[PDB]
Amino acid sequence: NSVDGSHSMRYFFTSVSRPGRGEPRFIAVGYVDDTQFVRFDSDAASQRMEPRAPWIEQEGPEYWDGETRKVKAHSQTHRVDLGTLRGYYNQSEAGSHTVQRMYGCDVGSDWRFLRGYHQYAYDGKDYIALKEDLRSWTAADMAAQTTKHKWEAAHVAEQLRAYLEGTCVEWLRRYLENGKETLQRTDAPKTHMTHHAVSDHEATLRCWALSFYPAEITLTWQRDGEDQTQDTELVETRPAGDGTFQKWAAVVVPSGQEQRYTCHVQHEGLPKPLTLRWEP
């Protein structure tokens, strides 16, 4: 709920135990804002951290060798973690369980440190999370309180704070200039409207926002300027697959009352809300 940072780097890790045999499946993904740049998949054949953005291919063998050595270390930790949590909650070997970890950093406009975070989850439920001061932990469970005690004694937060306020910030700053054309971009949404006659006394007006970045978007339907927070159908923002995002909203209007209705698009690249009408 706090203020947005100008930019953010985030890493997402998922381990899924596969009982029977085979090491659990491990996926690592790194984001700069809403742009993926790194991948590691245990089921993939490379067995290395791979680029998924052109501006990160610049980095030479020392970068990739280092990330590949450290991404497999993450893998190993969650292999131990998956066994620890199955012993913490006392569950059989036969069950398939999931471990999720995410950490990263935000910077303000000045590109200096603003916020850091590092959170775990077991089977979708919040487990352990590092506090906002980067000095204490929040346990969502009495089992996660055991990890809280183990980590507070080992001074784990001091090492994580070193990364969040240090390596995280400086290397995100470097990614921002290495990929200015992609990461420091603002794509204003392309907008249009469609009309579909539901029946004789009703029609649907769908308000389209396409090809925008970042993903943060607000579409709202109004009649006579009054927000129709109810009686409007909104869909979750989806990726177009080309590095831009899409969203639309629809409302059912009585025939002959279209002119009374306005759609509005609010985006980073629009200083004032953009008004959309029905005009064939």
Binding site: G30, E67, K70, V80, T84, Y103, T146, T147, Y163, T167
Partner: peptide
């Protein structure tokens, strides 16, 4: 770049 240091639960 990802963090260098990992710790177990």
């Amino acid at each position: 770049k990802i963090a260098d240091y990992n710790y177990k639960l």
